[PDB]
Design a protein around this ligand. Structure first.
Ligand SMILES: O=C(CO)[C@@H](O)[C@H](O)COP(=O)(O)O
Ligand SMILES: O=C(CO)[C@@H](O)[C@H](O)COP(=O)(O)O
Ligand SMILES: [Fe+2]
Ligand SMILES: [Fe+2]
Lengths: 220, 221
């Protein structure tokens, strides 16, 4: 039950379609699409209009996990749903009312993800863990790709896996073949990887390696 | 002195390099790149990281006109300059001190654009017109492509042309083979056109049509 979702942050953003196509053709389980509004984080990536074009290019079948690093996650729920996103992962730090937002995401037919930044206590998630589909434990400060993996986040992952056996747990930031085992042994089952996968001639082998390390570690 | 800059807002954003390349090959004078942060306008497009990738794909020749529909234009000046943008067009309504921002843009080596929304009186643009390279008169409410041209904006263009004869004046929003006449006769010499060029089977001829109409008006003056 371990899935690999490449991030395209450090890809050729002038050719997102081709970049994502290579990922899917290489056996990626899903695509992790980083949406930044220049406000919640100090960078701007793209929003629902790019997602709409991607969905048209990539077809109906691929799974889009939207990492919504935006200050008003309430605003982009319908636009993302209409564009064809499968999962809407908002930041607990950004919402005025998590309960209302979770409901709205579900009314819009999308799965619900909830992300926390490194400095955010994992216990902030407790009241919500039973209402969401996936918790995203950031392992770098959000805003940029290619940052250093924060191993000190692993106790958050372990705590979530122990307290909520059924919850999908995603890690995001500096995850690659060097750090994936740490994530898997802590309890993560959804693995975002960007820079580590993006340069490869044979992304399929790297993706398979991440997935296999993660699955065998989970089998324990 | 008339120039046509297609907008790629309603293009295939998953294939943005390809869309820009074919605009350039079709004779575009420049590329007009719409940057929206979801705050200044209710939509999000892309920012400096996409510009960087485009500059790498297109090379150093093409001119990028950055339409900065962002609420903190001060924040993105350096990042856009580093990404390879040529001109930074910010909104008058998006800053408390346009004078300081204008200075910072030039210090970062870029050309300076200054834009006003339809609801914003052209009078407020005037104090800065002698300090900028290009004034942008919006002819639709910013945030979305394919909207209807607001011909009621033409007196803004005409007034700027009269008061600032050497100023480059851009119009943006619903400009096409029909409405370009109004823009040209009013005094605009820089034409942004999105849906009219992008959804055309013959972008070259559309671009030629827009430039020719504008030149004819430019000559008459
Ligand atoms: O959300 C983010 C950054 O804000 C992550 O998705 C990064 O894009 C992960 O990329 P690498 O750290 O694997 O390069
Ligand atoms: O800045 C904008 C919209 O905010 C323009 O650049 C749009 O791209 C309008 O293009 P048209 O499709 O109306 O020509
Ligand atoms: Fe992410
Ligand atoms: Fe524009």
């Amino acid at each position: 039950g371990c899935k690999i979702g490449p991030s395209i942050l450090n890809s050729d953003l002038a050719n997102l379609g081709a970049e994502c196509l290579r990922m899917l053709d290489s056996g990626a389980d899903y695509l992790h699409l980083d949406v930044m509004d220049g406000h919640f984080v100090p960078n701007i990536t793209f929003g629902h209009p790019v997602v709409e074009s991607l969905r048209k290019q990539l077809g109906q079948d691929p799974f889009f996990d939207m990492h919504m690093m935006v200050s008003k996650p309430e605003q982009w729920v319908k636009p993302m749903a209409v564009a064809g996103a499968n999962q809407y992962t908002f930041h607990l730090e950004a919402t005025e009312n998590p309960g209302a937002l979770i409901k709205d995401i579900r009314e819009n037919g999308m799965k619900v993800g909830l992300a926390i930044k490194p400095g955010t206590s994992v216990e902030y998630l407790a009241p919500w863990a039973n209402q969401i589909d996936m918790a995203l434990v950031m392992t770098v400060e959000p805003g940029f790709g290619g940052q250093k993996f924060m191993e000190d986040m692993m106790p958050k992952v372990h705590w979530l896996r122990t307290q909520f056996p059924s919850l999908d747990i995603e890690v995001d930031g500096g995850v690659g073949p060097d750090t994936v085992h740490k994530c898997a042994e802590a309890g993560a089952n959804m693995i975002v990887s960007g820079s580590a996968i993006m340069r490869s001639e044979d992304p399929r082998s790297v993706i398979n390696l991440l997935r296999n390390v993660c699955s065998e570690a989970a089998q324990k």
